[PDB]
Amino acid sequence: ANLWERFCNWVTSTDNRLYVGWFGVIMIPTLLAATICFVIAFIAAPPVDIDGIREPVSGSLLYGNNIITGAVVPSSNAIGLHFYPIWEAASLDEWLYNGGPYQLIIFHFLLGASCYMGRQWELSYRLGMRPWICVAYSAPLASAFAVFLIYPIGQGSFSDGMPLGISGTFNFMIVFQAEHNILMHPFHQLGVAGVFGGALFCAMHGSLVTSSLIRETTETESANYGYKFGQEEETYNIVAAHGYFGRLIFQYASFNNSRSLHFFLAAWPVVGVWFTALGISTMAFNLNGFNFNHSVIDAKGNVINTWADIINRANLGMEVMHERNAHNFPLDLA
Amino acid sequence: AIFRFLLFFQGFHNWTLNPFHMMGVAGVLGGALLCAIHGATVENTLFQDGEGASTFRAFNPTQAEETYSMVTANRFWSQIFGIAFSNKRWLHFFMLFVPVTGLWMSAIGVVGLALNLRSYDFISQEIRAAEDPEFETFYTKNLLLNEGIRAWMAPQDQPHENFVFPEEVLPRGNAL
Amino acid sequence: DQKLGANVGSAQGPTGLGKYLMRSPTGEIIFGGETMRFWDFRGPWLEPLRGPNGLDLNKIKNDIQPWQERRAAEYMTHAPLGSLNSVGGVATEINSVNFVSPRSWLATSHFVLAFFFLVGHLWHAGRARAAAAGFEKGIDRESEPVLSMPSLD
Amino acid sequence: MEVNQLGLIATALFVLVPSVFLIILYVQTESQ
């Protein structure tokens, strides 16, 4: 064979410790660039004027942050959605002041994680598998696109992307609630059902299989040694686990088809996380959560507050304090 | 009502900053992760045990044999992610452990908050910020948000206190 | 504010940036405040004020017509912000105005649909590949590919 | 930053002690 075919065979080799593949050919260089830039920025990057008002925010460890407060700070509002590669800056110092690393990181990262997903498809084809793992990963990937890409697009600025930090994440969460009442949005409510219920069914399935492990060991050893990698037999009694769980509720609330049971496990969290990614992506275009402010009034017309009116009071305090120097005009329209 | 509770915990207790809640977040999101990835993995390493395109009919609860391939699943994840489960008992014990331990950790944090024993602040950041008007981080930005929540929501949320806040005392940024 | 006698060109806002007017990163004159992010906007009611360096202070001082003021007030009060039950405005606004921009409705609906059609692409593309190679129904127990492959380690 | 000086020792021992525990157990497992 010729050199191109040698290379193609290596790329798509199912014998490499880590599969490379064609998606991997793009995934590796972009994730490496994003990772290296992130690590260096989180430790050393100087302060960043996130809001474009010459009010730089310090995000890095060497400038007086810790792990919890540190962040790679989103790029300046002055830039909005403009592309700001290193080579558009007059100097690296300018690029650092204006939040260039955030653009480099999120773009390489979104690109690499998209290829991560495609890479999951690709190896499943080389191994003879069914192909849909990558679809499960599309729920978290879509979520990432929503906070780093879609929400900046709708709001017109990367300075309202999610910060790459722990405290910055919370900042993003709080400002969001104030400007979109995300808690009153049903797609987010579906996301909470998605992850709560996913945690539930995670513990449920683990507990139920664990409960019906077949005795294969003694009391002085881990029961885990009762399962041998590759073994053809099953290691728990699903009939026993159905008989336990069927009685705990009723018989038909309980699965006895393993395939149906495990598809339910895939589908529940994935769907819910699709909805909450769609929830961010549509609040990006300012279709916000339900608004029942002053929805109840009495016979005279007095406002009878509800808990929605109490939430609104909290939202207002977030609204009036966030970016306290950035608004010159009375509405915060983006 | 519960949403108001959430926001109360943010503005008064700074609960997002609390490491016991952070462990609990990791356990719940981690549980959801495990739920989704285990269900998907099994559905996409099934053996062909019937001739139909709908693969659900090819499982019989009395059968002895694993319905999917642990061996092919392990290799896929080893090559995709670097490690994989190799022991089905550890796998399902870990699915119990992760979300159960997450919730337990968050409970401890709330027991702390009963006493207002918060992780509200970082002293070193407050000492510097107080001295250095040019020092800003996302930590100080979020405290201003908490301050906004408390003074704007308190009078109506705790009416028995008869809080009366003239407009002039309300913390507000420019314009808004 | 200009109508009240403000010199809108020399009004330093709180941050030191112009309260009404500032420069974009390439120098063009633009509206100040958070809207600095939207200075790429172009529209018929606004372009008459534009000169070669961006907004022109002589046109601002002299040439703003009533129809421009009307348009600007109309559009400000119809920004595409609103609640799912169609309460127009920011999330903290009280009920009164029954409004959601059709731009919001059209953008949100078609993102949702687009996203779900990417998922269906992945579903049916992955499936058509697996079907064409003949393992869309599962792995063959008697010829499991991985079993004939060398251990990774 | 005016941090806590016992922070260093607390972090160091927090890592060191449990980690050494596990290392001790793993090595003596391997040599039997």
């Binding site: 430790i43 990698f229 073994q231 | 392990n74 490690i83 994989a84 | 380690d153 | 941090v3 922070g7 260093l8």
Partner: peptide
Amino acid sequence: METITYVFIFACIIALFFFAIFFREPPRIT
């Protein structure tokens, strides 16, 4: 000192990734 401590722990974790992947106990088909 606190910067050095945060970075040291992060570095150790990246080292553990390497060993956990490349020097795992090899799963073998029994």
